[PDB]
Amino acid sequence: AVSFIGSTENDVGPSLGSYSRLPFVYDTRNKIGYQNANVWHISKGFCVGLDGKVDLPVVGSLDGQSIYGLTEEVGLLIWMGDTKYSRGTAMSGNSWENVFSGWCVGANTASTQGLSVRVTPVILKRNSARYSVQKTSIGSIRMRPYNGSSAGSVQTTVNFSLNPFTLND
Numbered sequence: 651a652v653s654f655i656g657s658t659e660n661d662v663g664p665s666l667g668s669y670s671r672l673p674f675v676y677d678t679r680n681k682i683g684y685q686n687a688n689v690w691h692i693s694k695g696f697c698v699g700l701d702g703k704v705d706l707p708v709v710g711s712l713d714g715q716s717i718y719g720l721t722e723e724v725g726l727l728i729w730m731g732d733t734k735y736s737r738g739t740a741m742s743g744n745s746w747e748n749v750f751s752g753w754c755v756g757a758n759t760a761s762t763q764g765l766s767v768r769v770t771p772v773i774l775k776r777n778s779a780r781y782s783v784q785k786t787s788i789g790s791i792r793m794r795p796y797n798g799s800s801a802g803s804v805q806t807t808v809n810f811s812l813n814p815f816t817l818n819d
């Protein structure tokens with residue numbers, strides 16, 4: 651079986667977080683992220699993976715992944731995937747992409763399916779040596795059942811918004 655147990659709207663990163671160092675990529679590791687091991691409860695052989703989609707405009711590229719734009723001065727590299735941040739899939743474009751190939755829980759057991767979203771800031775332009783970014787809608791992640799598993803009457807999609815932050819130049 652499957653049931654939705656998480657939240658529809660999720661914030662990425664600590665609000666008002668500040669990060670210090672073209673394009674220039676800020677090393678923020680996993681600090682600007684959202685992670686929740688338990689978004690769907692699954693059991694008895696349910697098989698599920700994850701699809702992700704970024705709605706921000708693509709303003710460039712870096713090593714194969716899109717630089718998504720927030721402001722004329724700030725962009726973002728974005729990853730979406732299974733719970734642990736190391737499993738993140740680098741996002742490109744604006745279409746649904748497979749960000750977690752999936753797994754099946756046991757026939758006689760139960761567990762949960764989670765997810766993570768992580769971004770790293772990119773300075774596109776310079777300017778009081780500071781860059782502010784308002785709360786911004788990023789995109790979404792939808793569970794992707796397989797092997798005959800069914801979404802049934804369950805919420806399949808959750809959204810993500812980037813919490814406001816400040817970059818120090």
Ligand SMILES: CC(=O)N[C@@H]1[C@@H](O)[C@H](O)[C@@H](CO)O[C@H]1O
Nearest residue numbers: 687688732733753761762763764
């Ligand atoms: C740690 C936990 O409670 N549940 C994890 C879940 O977050 C993850 O999506 C899934 C597939 O890797 O594996 C479960 O064990």
